[PDB]
Design an enzyme around this catalytic site. Structure first.
Site, PDB file in Angstrom:
ATOM      1  N   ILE A  32       3.638 -29.137   4.727  1.00 55.98           N
ATOM      2  CA  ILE A  32       3.664 -27.721   5.069  1.00 55.98           C
ATOM      3  C   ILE A  32       4.755 -27.032   4.264  1.00 55.98           C
ATOM      4  CG2 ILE A  32       4.071 -26.045   6.904  1.00 55.98           C
ATOM      5  CD1 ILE A  32       2.867 -29.525   7.809  1.00 55.98           C
ATOM      6  N   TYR A  40      11.258 -37.297  12.606  1.00 56.73           N
ATOM      7  CA  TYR A  40      11.004 -36.148  13.460  1.00 56.73           C
ATOM      8  C   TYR A  40      10.089 -36.512  14.626  1.00 56.73           C
ATOM      9  CZ  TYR A  40       6.091 -35.193  12.479  1.00 56.73           C
ATOM     10  OH  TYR A  40       4.719 -35.252  12.426  1.00 56.73           O
ATOM     11  N   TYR A  70       0.184 -23.086   9.306  1.00 59.08           N
ATOM     12  CA  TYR A  70      -1.194 -23.523   9.471  1.00 59.08           C
ATOM     13  C   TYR A  70      -2.207 -22.390   9.411  1.00 59.08           C
ATOM     14  CZ  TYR A  70      -0.987 -28.537  10.406  1.00 59.08           C
ATOM     15  OH  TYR A  70      -0.865 -29.902  10.280  1.00 59.08           O
ATOM     16  N   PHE A  88      10.154 -28.890  15.328  1.00 59.21           N
ATOM     17  CA  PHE A  88      10.460 -30.281  15.034  1.00 59.21           C
ATOM     18  C   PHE A  88      11.967 -30.486  15.006  1.00 59.21           C
ATOM     19  CE2 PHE A  88       6.661 -29.164  12.419  1.00 59.21           C
ATOM     20  CZ  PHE A  88       5.717 -29.770  13.224  1.00 59.21           C
ATOM     21  N   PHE A  93       2.955 -33.512  20.690  1.00 57.86           N
ATOM     22  CA  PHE A  93       1.737 -33.966  20.033  1.00 57.86           C
ATOM     23  C   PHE A  93       1.968 -35.049  18.991  1.00 57.86           C
ATOM     24  CE2 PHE A  93       1.759 -32.107  15.722  1.00 57.86           C
ATOM     25  CZ  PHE A  93       2.911 -31.352  15.807  1.00 57.86           C
ATOM     26  N   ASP A  94       3.155 -35.114  18.392  1.00 53.81           N
ATOM     27  CA  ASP A  94       3.458 -36.124  17.390  1.00 53.81           C
ATOM     28  C   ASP A  94       4.866 -36.654  17.615  1.00 53.81           C
ATOM     29  OD1 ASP A  94       3.005 -37.832  15.318  1.00 53.81           O
ATOM     30  OD2 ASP A  94       3.192 -36.340  13.720  1.00 53.81           O
TER      31      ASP A  94
END
Lengths: 87, 107, 761, 145, 146
Positions: free
Chosen positions: B56, B26, B82, B99, B36-37
């Site tokens: 998660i 992902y 979150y 994602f 961010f990732d």
């Protein structure tokens, strides 16, 4: 009986202590005069107001550490060793 | 209330079982924001197990109904992903997570 | 906006540089959480792309390099550098298989010294314990719950090392080609960051053997071929920062060489002591076989049996030569080997052994010539570069001094006993890494957990030289003096952590003797610090002081005098204090300190008798100091103000049964009787020895007269004659303590003496 | 008396068009006198070690008097000198000061001095502070934009 | 050397010992050039404190005492045998003085500093004029001798 039948670690530590208290550190080097002669003899490898290359940067650095602020200073084993070597 | 946009090419008819290990590929993407990732940036797939939490819960329930090689846009709702606290310094609070998981495990 | 744009937007470039500075400062000195947070923004791919790119500007390149250094390879580098002065070797066949290794291939003693840091070095250092970064793991529901902090993000070490090697190769090729376009616009921005990176990787210890050989070859391809084109960095005009980086590189190489040398010496020492033990066993066997026809049999038995092993080893070794004197009980077989090893070691150092441009063909001569060459250039305007230069020069001329400094930090660990050593070293590294960070709740919890997971180690019980070296007691004292002193009333901040510390201090006192003396002076500093700040309840350091001098018989004789004055002054001040915490706890306001007075009396009890004797000097000093101030030992109730001891103990008794002055576990009567018992026990133990010395001097008689006049007669007997409780409904520490009668008996025997009528009574 | 004088001169609600309270020949001589007083305090606490420690008593007033419209020049530099020459006041910094600093950064443009001050606010004289760093990494960067 | 000795005041650490040893090493024999250079430097700088530091350093020197000797004798009496603690109990019986070498070195340095018959250093030491504070080292030395 106390000599043999002992772990090797005690023997190794005891040998280290005895070798520390041995003919080492008996002033068998006399290297200080050689180094002092070898430093100042190199005045200019290929060179009026120019400061001498050896034995002057060290003196100026020590003087500038002397003339610093914040009361007195401590530690500084470099000046220790160098003053001892010169003496 | 999670929308899934499956991309049909990529074949695959092997659903992930419970208890085994599968890899993912992902890349993170924040809503109306930036990236961010990215697992592709690290050049290393992420390995995780199914049924032992450690991820998660929203991401797990979004990736549950998926096949091998079928990417989609799993939009995770913030109230269960979150929460109101969020990750302190990476993910802002109460923000959805998007994602595109890609499967390449050989099993 | 494009990163590569430097000519315009100069303010934006300065802003980005300061942003990188802020990012580096945030991730400084630990803080793995912000390390992961920055890893989220500036990920691995971006860092590698900024690394590989060469068209980038100077300041941004330096900022990115230092940011990568401070994010990934910072904590492990600091942890490994904090323990570079510790050398520990195990007992494995690999250790016995490594030695000085002279180049015997077409050579011998008059050969090279070998390339330093070629591997095959054995030591005991903890692993770095990296962890891959992640962002899809849910945080635990429990808050902290004694979490063991985090770990720095992991990156491929081999790929990074290869990239650094090819980067340095490209940089040195460009420097040899003398291009007019630097990578960062200047020589500094081209050389300094990559040199810093490769220095950090070399300190890391990731390189093997071929990589180190290649690095040493490219540093100077002139005297490193024993294993015009591609000129080394040593033959290129470079600015000051490049000189600093090369100086640090040379210092690391020399440290590696010294570690290899001390490991080889340890292996030789193990072999030598094995041979000596075998020879001693053989000599004892021959002596047992033939023990008759001799006149010094008793002398030999006393020498080889009734002597400590230290003295025996010193006699058998220091007398081997004695500057050509012999007179040793050893043969002439191992002597030749010892002389050969000594000659080889002196040849390995910077000693010519014969008389006391040119190719150096070594490392020491190379660095000396290079430093002289740098000195011969223009005057250096950077003081730190000059200081590092002179430190490197002096460090490479006196191997004896550095060897004498390094030997006390050397030890040999038993084989198959390395797991506990690794655990202890990792705990010490964690202790230091939390020392360099300011205190707080989570870190104090982690420190308490670590010091509680260090007790069951099976290493601290033995080998006192491990803790005598290193200096970890000094680290513990620095930590505790940081949490205790420095903030006036901030001593009460963060309690409940001094208990484990004080237990550790007491154990370290009870281990050995030199450690006992060192921690004695350190604990004297601690008791001074506690006195300047009134101290604290629970595991008071005064109890540690009392427990440290339980049996010394050497420190009390040479103990100082001003410390006793400070102790008695603090005791008097506590006696004249009103105990603000006791009145707030639910007790009446009484101008007296029960707990502090009892603890002070307990400490003074342990600092007089030594080993059952009575030191007359300390006894008379403490008597003079105690009696010099009338406002002492409860001047308003002991009898100084016009009261009586019998009246005081009767009042304490009347308070003891059915108390009414106080409310709710320590009441006033028990504290009063314990204080009086402690004071009387201290007075009894302070008697001037026995009748053996009182019949010749007058000071003992004067002390006895003063002690007898201080407390009247018909008082101890009356206290003893007071009835006790039922002899065996349940009772606790509120009534008379049976140990009080023992104190009364001891004081009566050691002070008043004996007669017929009083004895029968 | 300098702090009292600054407070009395700063009673103006905007310090721009409120000069009618004082009268004429005061509106023109406002920014220059404010900047001169700020620079005077700046040169006063610059260089001295004991002076910064003595003055490090009320940082809340300095923080509150930071984003006073025109007061960007100066004032901030005083706090920078206090931070550099007295690394002991960095103990009572709550989230209010960090929020005020972030608001100043977002309100007065991308000034490098603000980032320099924030950089000096985390690391102390050889000792790192976990609380300040954790507060900075979650408030100045709670995300992006 | 004169600046290093004028930095540390009162403290008798290894700094002062090394400085005094270097002063002995450089001034051995009493060169006139070195004395002239030191006089010129002191007159040009006119810095007070070096004399104050010297006076404070010499004021804290060590003398023989009876109670310390009795304590040392009691320690040397031993009475018990420990793990090779005889060589570590005392520094070869130097607990009575512990400062004789340093005091001798300092007095030797002062002697080598004032050994020439130029009649210039004596007037400076008795009453310096470039500074606004008189130290009068002679009276302090007399007190030390007493």
């Amino acid at each position: 009986t106390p000599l043999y039948n002992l772990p090797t670690h005690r023997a190794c530590n005891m040998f280290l202590e005895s070798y520390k208290a041995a003919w080492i550190l008996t002033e068998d080097h006399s290297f200080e005069d050689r180094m002092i002669d070898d430093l100042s003899k190199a005045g200019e490898q290929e060179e009026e107001e120019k400061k001498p290359d050896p034995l002057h940067q060290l003196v100026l650095h020590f003087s500038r550490t002397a003339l610093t602020e914040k009361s007195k200073l401590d530690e500084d084993y470099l000046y220790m060793a160098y003053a001892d070597i010169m003496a | 209330g999670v929308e899934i946009e499956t991309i049909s090419p990529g074949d695959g008819r092997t659903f992930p079982k419970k208890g085994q290990t599968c890899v993912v590929h992902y890349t993170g993407m924040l809503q109306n924001g930036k990236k961010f990732d990215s697992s592709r940036d690290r050049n290393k797939p992420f390995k995780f197990r199914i049924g032992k939490q450690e991820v998660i819960k929203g991401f797990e329930e979004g990736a549950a109904q998926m096949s091998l090689g079928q990417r989609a846009k799993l939009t995770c709702t913030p109230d269960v992903a979150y929460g109101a606290t969020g990750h302190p310094g990476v993910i802002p609070p109460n923000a959805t997570l998007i994602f595109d998981v890609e499967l390449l495990n050989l099993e | 906006m494009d990163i590569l744009e430097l000519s315009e937007r100069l303010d934006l470039q300065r802003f980005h540089s300061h942003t990188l500075r802020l990012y580096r400062a945030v991730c400084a000195l630990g803080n793995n959480r912000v390390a992961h947070a920055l890893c989220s923004h500036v990920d691995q791919a971006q860092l590698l792309h900024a690394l590989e790119d060469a068209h980038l500007p100077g300041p941004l390149r330096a900022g990115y390099y230092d940011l990568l250094i401070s994010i990934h390879l910072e904590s492990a580098c600091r942890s490994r550098r904090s323990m570079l002065s510790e050398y520990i070797v195990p007992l494995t066949p690999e250790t016995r298989a490594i030695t000085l290794f002279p180049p015997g291939r077409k050579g011998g003693n008059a050969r090279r010294h070998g390339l330093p840091g070629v591997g095959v070095t054995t030591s005991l250092r903890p692993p770095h314990h990296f962890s891959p970064p992640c962002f899809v793991a849910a945080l635990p529901a429990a808050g902290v719950a004694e979490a063991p902090a985090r770990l720095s993000p992991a990156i491929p070490l081999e790929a990074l090392r290869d990239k650094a090697l090819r980067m340095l190769g490209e940089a040195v090729r460009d420097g040899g080609q003398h291009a007019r376009d630097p990578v960062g616009g200047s020589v500094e921005f081209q050389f300094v960051p990559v040199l810093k990176l490769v220095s950090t990787l070399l300190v890391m210890g990731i390189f093997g053997d071929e990589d180190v050989k290649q690095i040493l070859k490219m540093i100077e391809p002139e005297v490193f071929t024993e294993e015009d084109l591609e000129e080394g960095l040593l033959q290129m005009k470079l600015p000051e920062s490049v000189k600093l980086q090369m100086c640090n590189l040379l210092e690391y190489f020399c440290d590696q060489e010294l570690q290899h040398r001390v490991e080889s010496l340890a292996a030789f020492a193990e072999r030598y002591v094995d041979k000596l033990q075998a020879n001693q066993r053989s000599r004892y066997a021959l002596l047992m076989r033939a023990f008759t026809m001799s006149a010094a049999e008793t002398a030999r038995r006393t020498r080889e049996f009734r002597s400590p092993p230290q003295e025996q080893i010193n006699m058998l070794l220091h007398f081997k030569d004695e500057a050509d004197e012999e007179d040793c009980p050893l043969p002439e077989d191992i002597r030749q080997d010892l002389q050969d090893f000594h000659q080889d070691l002196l040849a390995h150092c910077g000693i010519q052994l014969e008389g006391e441009e040119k190719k150096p063909q070594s490392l020491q001569e190379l660095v000396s010539h290079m430093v002289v060459r740098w000195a011969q250039e223009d005057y250096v305007q950077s003081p730190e570069l000059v200081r590092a230069m002179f430190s490197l020069l002096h460090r490479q001329y006196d191997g004896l001094g550095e060897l004498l400094r390094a030997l006390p930090r050397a030890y040999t660990i038993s084989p198959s006993s390395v797991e506990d050593t690794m655990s202890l070293l990792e705990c010490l590294g964690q202790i230091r890494s939390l020392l360099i960070v300011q205190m707080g709740p989570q870190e104090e919890n982690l420190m308490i957990q670590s010091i509680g997971n260090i007790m069951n180690n099976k290493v601290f019980y033995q080998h006192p030289n491990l803790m005598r070296a290193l200096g970890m007691h000094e680290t513990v004292m620095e930590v505790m003096v940081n949490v205790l002193g420095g903030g006036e009333t901030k001593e009460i901040r963060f309690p409940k952590m001094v208990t484990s510390c004080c237990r550790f201090l007491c154990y370290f006192c009870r281990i050995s003797r030199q450690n006992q003396r060192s921690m004695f002076d350190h604990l004297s500093y601690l008791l001074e610090n506690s006195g300047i700040g009134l101290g604290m309840q629970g595991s008071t350091p005064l109890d540690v002081a009392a427990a440290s001098v339980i049996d010394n018989n050497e420190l009390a004789l040479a103990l100082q005098e001003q410390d006793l004055e400070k102790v008695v002054s603090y005791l008097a001040g506590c006696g004249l204090q009103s105990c603000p915490m006791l009145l707030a706890k639910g007790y009446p306001d009484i101008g007296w300190n029960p707990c502090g007075g009892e603890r002070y009396l307990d400490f003074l009890r342990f600092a007089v008798f030594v080993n059952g004797e009575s030191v007359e000097e300390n006894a008379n000093v403490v008597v003079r100091l105690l009696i010099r101030k009338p406002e002492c030992f409860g001047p308003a109730l002991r009898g100084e103000g016009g009261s009586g001891l019998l009246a005081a103990i009767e009042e304490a008794i009347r308070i003891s049964e059915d108390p009414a002055r106080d409310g709710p576990r320590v009441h006033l009567g028990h504290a009063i009787m314990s204080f009086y018992a402690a004071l009387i026990d201290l007075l009894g133990r302070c008697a001037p020895e026995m009748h053996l010395i009182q019949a010749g001097k007058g000071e003992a008689l004067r002390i006895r007269a003063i002690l007898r006049s201080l407390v009247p007669l018909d008082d101890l007997v009356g206290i003893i004659s007071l009835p006790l409780q039922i002899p065996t409904q349940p009772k606790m520490s509120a009534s008379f303590v049976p140990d009080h009668k023992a104190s009364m008996v001891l004081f009566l025997d050691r002070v008043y003496g004996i007669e017929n009528q009083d004895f029968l009574l | 008396l300098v702090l009292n004088c600054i407070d009395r001169l700063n009673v103006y609600t905007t310090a721009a068009h409120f000069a009618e309270y004082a009268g004429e020949e005061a509106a023109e001589s406002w920014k220059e006198i404010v900047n001169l007083l700020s620079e005077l305090l700046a040169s006063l606490i610059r260089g001295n070690r004991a002076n910064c420690a003595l003055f490090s008593t009320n940082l809340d007033w300095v923080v509150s008097k930071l984003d006073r419209l025109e007061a960007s020049s100066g004032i901030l530099e005083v706090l920078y000198c206090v931070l550099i020459e007295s690394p002991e006041v960095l103990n009572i910094i709550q989230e209010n000061h960090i929020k005020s600093i972030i608001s100043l950064l977002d309100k007065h443009g991308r000034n490098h001095k603000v980032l320099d001050v924030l950089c000096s606010l985390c690391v102390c004289n050889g000792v790192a502070v976990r609380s300040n760093q954790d507060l900075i990494t979650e408030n100045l960067l709670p995300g992006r934009e | 050397v004169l600046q290093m000795i004028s930095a540390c005041k009162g403290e008798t650490g290894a700094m002062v010992s090394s400085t005094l040893k270097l002063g002995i090493s450089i001034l051995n024999g009493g060169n006139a050039e070195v004395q002239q250079k030191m006089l010129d430097y002191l007159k040009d700088k006119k810095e007070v404190g070096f004399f104050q530091s010297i006076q404070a350093l010499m004021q804290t020197c060590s003398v023989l005492d009876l109670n310390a000797f009795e304590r040392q004798n009691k320690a040397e009496g031993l009475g018990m045998v420990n793990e090779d603690g005889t060589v570590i109990n005392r520094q070869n019986g130097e607990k009575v003085m512990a400062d004789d070498e340093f005091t001798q070195d300092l007095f030797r340095f002062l002697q080598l500093l004032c050994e020439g018959h130029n009649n210039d250093f004596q007037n400076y030491l008795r009453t310096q004029t470039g500074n606004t504070t008189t130290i009068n080292i002679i009276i302090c030395t007399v007190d030390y001798l007493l």
